[PDB]
Swiss-Prot record, chain B:
Tissue and organ distribution: Expressed at the posterior end of developing oocytes (at protein level). Preferential expression in the pole cells, at different developmental stages.
Shown part of the complete sequence: 80 to 259 of 259
PTM comment: Phosphorylation increases the ability of the protein to bind to mRNA caps and to form the eIF4F complex.
Residue positions binding mRNA: 65-66, 118-123
Protein name (record): Eukaryotic translation initiation factor 4E1
Keywords: Cytoplasm, Initiation factor, Nucleus, Phosphoprotein, Protein biosynthesis, RNA-binding, Translation regulation
Taxonomy, superkingdom: Eukaryota
Keyword S-adenosyl-L-methionine: no
Taxon lineage: Eukaryota, Metazoa, Ecdysozoa, Arthropoda, Hexapoda
């Protein structure tokens, strides 16, 4: 995705770990975001 | 593999209404991708049982105002005059993205967020550390109003946990 100057990115590991709403939502569809997580309670699962 | 790390570790909580014992620690995460891995596989706030809560707090802060981390703080409360599936899910998710993304200048003052599903009314709250830090509370409040496009259907009020009067109203 697009990154701002000074922002953390794979190309800029020293950048600030601050992300905008739009940037965060763009990462919602990557493969790592689609893996099922490990959770203790089940009632909140669809 | 190449995940985007978050500035803080976050823990998701789920309170199920019944007779502290009902606060349940769901899981913790510290990257953007691990957050979406969690959010994409759990019920949205519009689908959880009446009387339940979701909470997202920095690691080892419990969603309990009497705990030392929250005792001296307050909360920005968002109310919906007319509730709907769309506003509930969109507002909650947008609040979570503000938190994990560190969208506020006063990041250190944010403890977490809570959404109460209470049927005919619903509340979304952002808990801060010190209710006397006027600069931080107002900066967070103004950011919420803009980032969430709050308007006529909403009221933005800052209330001390110890208190029902409000300290600020936006």
């Amino acid at each position: 995705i697009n990154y701002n100057e000074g922002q953390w990115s794979p190309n800029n590991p020293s950048g600030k770990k601050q992300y905008d709403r739009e940037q965060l939502l763009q990462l919602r569809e990557v493969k790592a975001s689609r893996i099922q997580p490990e959770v203790k309670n089940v009632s909140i699962l669809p | 593999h190449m995940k985007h790390p978050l500035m803080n570790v976050w823990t998701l909580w789920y309170l199920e209404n019944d007779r502290e014992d009902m606060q349940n620690e769901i899981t913790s995460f510290d990257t953007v991708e691990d957050f979406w891995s969690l959010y994409n596989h759990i019920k949205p706030p519009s689908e959880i049982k009446l009387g339940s809560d979701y909470s997202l707090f920095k690691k080892n802060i419990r969603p309990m105002w009497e705990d030392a981390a929250n005792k001296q703080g307050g909360r920005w409360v968002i109310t919906l005059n007319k509730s709907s599936k769309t506003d509930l899910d969109n507002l909650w998710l947008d609040v979570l993205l503000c938190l994990i993304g560190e969208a506020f200048d006063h990041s250190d003052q944010i403890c977490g967020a809570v959404i109460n599903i209470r049927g005919k009314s619903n509340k979304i709250s952002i808990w801060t550390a010190d209710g006397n830090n006027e600069e931080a509370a107002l900066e967070i409040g103004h950011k919420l109003r803009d980032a969430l496009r709050l308007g006529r259907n909403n009221s933005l009020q800052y209330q001390l946990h110890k208190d029902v009067k409000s300290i600020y109203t936006l």
